[PDB]
Structures are given as C-alpha cells and as structure tokens.
Design a protein around this ligand. Structure first.
Ligand code: ZN
Ligand code: ZN
Ligand code: ZN
Length: 87
DNA sequence: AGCGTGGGCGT
DNA sequence: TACGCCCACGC
C-alpha cells in the first residue's frame, strides 16, 4: 500500500515514496524554490522551470517524426503526431 | 495552440 | 533527499 500520508488535515492523499510526499507538501506550504531569471516568476518544480524558460528563449528540442515540426515539450509533440492519422 | 503543473516514477 | 524525464489533466 501507500504508507506515506499527507499530515494536512484537509488532505487525505497517500504516497509510496518519501520524496513524493515531500514534493506534495509544497502545494500546502506554497513553497516555490525555483525562479525564472528572465521574468522572475517562481516555480515549485525545477523541471517545470526548464520548460517554462523555453517560452522566453523559443527553444524547441522535439521534432515530429512525420513532418518535422518542432515543439518545446515532448508531450506537445505527442499530441501533435496523431493528427497525421486520417482514420 | 501554448503552457501551467501535479502524478509516477528512474536514477 | 534532488534531478529530470514521460505522462497526464486542465485551461
Ligand atoms: Zn496534502
Ligand atoms: Zn520566465
Ligand atoms: Zn507532424
């Protein structure tokens, strides 16, 4: 089962790993340790900060295998690729 | 479309 | 524990 439960009285979510609960607590504490150097916006997660910066830089590492169109995030590419399916 | 952001991991 | 993938869900 999931032994790590959120100690917040209003929350009843559970987790299987320690660090996942630790990350979840930041939702309640509102902790946002990672800041964008460009627009000074704060983020709760380092990886989400990385993808956010691409909105400023215009970096798009992920290209569609079918047409070559580039995207800032991998899930953006995945959502796109399926449109080449014409049933 | 553009993108915030939590969840579920693997390392 | 932190780091950073994929993956979802949502607007
Ligand atoms: Zn909670
Ligand atoms: Zn920014
Ligand atoms: Zn394409």
């Amino acid at each position: 089962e999931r032994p790590y439960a959120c100690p917040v009285e209003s929350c009843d979510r559970r987790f299987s790993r320690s660090d996942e609960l630790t990350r979840h607590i930041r939702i309640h504490t509102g902790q946002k340790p990672f800041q964008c150097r460009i627009c000074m916006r704060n983020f709760s997660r380092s990886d989400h900060l990385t993808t956010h910066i691409r909105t400023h830089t215009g970096e798009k590492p992920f290209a569609c295998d079918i047409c070559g169109r580039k995207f800032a995030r991998s899930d953006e590419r995945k959502r796109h690729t399926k449109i080449h399916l014409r049933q």
